[PDB]
Design a protein around this nucleic acid. Sequence first.
RNA 1: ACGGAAACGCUUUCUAGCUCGCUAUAAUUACCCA
RNA 2: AAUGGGUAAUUAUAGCGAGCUAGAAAGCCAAAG
Lengths: 121, 121, 217, 107, 344
Amino acid sequence: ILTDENYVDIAEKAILKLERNTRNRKNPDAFFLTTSKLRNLLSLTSTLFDESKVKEYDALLDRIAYLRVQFVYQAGREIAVKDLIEKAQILEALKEIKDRETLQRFCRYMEALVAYFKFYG
Amino acid sequence: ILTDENYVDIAEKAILKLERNTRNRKNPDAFFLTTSKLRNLLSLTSTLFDESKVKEYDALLDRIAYLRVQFVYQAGREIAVKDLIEKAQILEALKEIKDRETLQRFCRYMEALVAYFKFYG
Amino acid sequence: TFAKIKFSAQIRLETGLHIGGSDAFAAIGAINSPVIKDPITNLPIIPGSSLKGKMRTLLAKVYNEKVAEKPSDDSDILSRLFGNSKDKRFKMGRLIFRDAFLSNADELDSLGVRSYTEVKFENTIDRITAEANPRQIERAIRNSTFDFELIYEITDENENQVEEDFKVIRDGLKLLELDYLGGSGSRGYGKVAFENLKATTVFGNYDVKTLNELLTA
Amino acid sequence: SLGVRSYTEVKFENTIDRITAEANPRQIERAIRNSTFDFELIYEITDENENQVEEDFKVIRDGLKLLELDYLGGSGSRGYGKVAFENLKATTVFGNYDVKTLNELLT
Amino acid sequence: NDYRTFKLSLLTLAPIHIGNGEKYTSREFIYENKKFYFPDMGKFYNKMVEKRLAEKFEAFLIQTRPNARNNRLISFLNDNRIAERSFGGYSISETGLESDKNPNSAGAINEVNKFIRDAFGNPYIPGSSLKGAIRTILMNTTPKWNNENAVNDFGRFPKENKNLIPWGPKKGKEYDDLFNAIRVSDSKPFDNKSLILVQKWDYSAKTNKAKPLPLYRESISPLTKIEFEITTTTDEAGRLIEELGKRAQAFYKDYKAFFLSEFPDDKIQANLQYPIYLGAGSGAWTKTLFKQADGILQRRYSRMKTKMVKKGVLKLTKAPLKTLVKNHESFYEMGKANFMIKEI
RNA sequence: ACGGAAACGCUUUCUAGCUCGCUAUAAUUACCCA
RNA sequence: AAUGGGUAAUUAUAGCGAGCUAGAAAGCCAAAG
């Protein structure tokens, strides 16, 4: 769960709580998770963060159902994204949308994950 | 039957309700159903999920009739796919298309089956 | 004086092109690199931004005596045609590359064509372990054609620069025949034949009969 | 009524550095192709010309011929814009001026 | 203009099957005459539901009876008396053998693949398929591109590293990108009256036999002239296309002595030109760095279908003889193609 | 027989210029199962 | 041995995610008286 006053500090903690490549000491403490696998997840939510402005919530609930498809599917492919949806409680937060203002809160929550990931290494 | 707010949670339950290889304890609780037999089913629907965007529904109703052919035919060959179309109510949902927005809802329903199958083992 | 003339030319495809589009909600087991499309007809579109982006970069090897490293380091023959942002008199710049839309939607329906965008499976093969990595990219089809509009301004500065600029425009269009309009290009995906290069006036008064001799040379 | 989901398309788009061939992508929003927009003017005649009325519309109809050739707003030398003015009709709303003798200039 | 073109005259000796992913099943073709009719199954079931037959046809596809001639959908159009033959799709003639020498077993092919086709339906060879053949010739011969395309310590014998060959943006640096400077163009669409559907014949060493497989591969007839226009823009790429006369000989010299040695010699074709191995059926050792994949490629098989006896069994097929095979009983090699370049 | 009466925050002004959705990538591997 | 069949894997990977220029001017007014 994530409120408006904490969802960035939640996402700041989740990147720190995510593991790093403790071996392979060539620019070490780098993540197993990569930037391009992370931007494939935000490419789902960023096209809903701007159709939340335009459209109703009553038309977006077909793709909001589809975000549980592909956040599961991207987690099944690579084990690094598998850890992201566990640490950042994404599959818990995605089942809790129910209106426009949480859809925009979750889609800003994914942007906070990308921001601190780019920040911390 | 499947609405927009449940068809992923239906497909999440259907993979869990599907049986596993209870014997042969070499990475156990694996499915009798395999990935490659499952991706042969989605290869039918994925080429309609992107011609639903382009074309009318009035031209796709020849291949939507053909999905009842081959979901039956793939079920007749291997008994593992036979259980998939029973647990995941696919033959019930395939007879209920009637427009573009359910065709895309069913074709996203098949992707939810592939997603959780890759997720759960 | 003021005149605006128009290059009503026609792109013909050969081994038709890919021009990417993100389409995040595309599918899972299908097209993960869609072609850009007209959102009302869902037809393949050659936008003018990727037509103009080639003809500065293809003509940078011909009409720059000094290597660029940026736009607005070009050599005032590209700048007055295309435009800069760090020059003063060449910011708005004598070329409005209008987009090109799929013209022969009926000729393709006359032949045996189901969909206007063929999908190709492409398989990055790993050269150790031989293990695959398929992708399904989407491209326009082989004998598609496009209405290619291009509008040339003639203000009160083109004294005799009209002919000098048209030596350049038929140096960038006959060089896109040797290049690939974006996409992948080094794997097919680009070669085009600019049919029916035909200037005409749409505003003002400017004699174009001395212009239709080097366009069709 | 057609297949349009959103009234704005978002075309993805980049730029390539000329040395070092690095891409720098952008997502710019864009009104879709077959929109029609209600366009109106108000031309007032304040009795301070008394003869300039018939030749101001020769400028206005010329001005709307130039926007169909130029681009009307935005990044238009890379494709965009290209408006098309349709169904022009001059109709007096206040006052009493004969527009059907003028409506031939608009055709 | 640095765009110095070429013209790579690809000639096929072995039949070449490439791409499209999909595959017809054993209920999606008709063998009545000496052609295999592959119908548009959307127009099949629509024309056949109009004959009030879709209840039996759904029961026909769950019907696993012996004598496989009575399972391959000719028998549905025989027993139900339908002879219109107006369905969507195409036809390709028979190979002639294309089954294991049994007259009664004819039409007992089960799953063909589908050769790559454009949206007009005509087959072609794409340039992206042909460029992956050049890239193996260019990777294998170059010593610098063999020293370590290492497992990187991030996987089990995992990948070529993708950095042996310099490629990318390289921010700050210039932009070389050698294979952007080799622009292989797609072939012209030829006709589907050159397609024969050869069948795989796995000829293994240490079990001197040629056990066939239920794979069909719609593929090109032998002795077919297919043309590619390869342009280069760099001096570094302008050398390496000119050196295909040396390297495609030196690849096949390095490949005959590595893998084709210890196989019996009569199966192996002769070159007649500069040889090249195109897609789908030329083994794993022509799609790889064959001297840096000996302890790595066999890791992927702890299964029932393992690649036993180290290097995998030589892949053969059967197709009619023209002008070549250098052995009786029609044993081609699945990808033994020949090219010669010339500059335009 | 109101520190009141009378008084348009108004006129002029393109969110514009320049910019390739691009770069690499063979639909391929293994050959067995009942 | 015949004969019946295909089976498993991969479903895109790595990047870039916008940069720079302009950020209010000129009138009224005020000034000059």
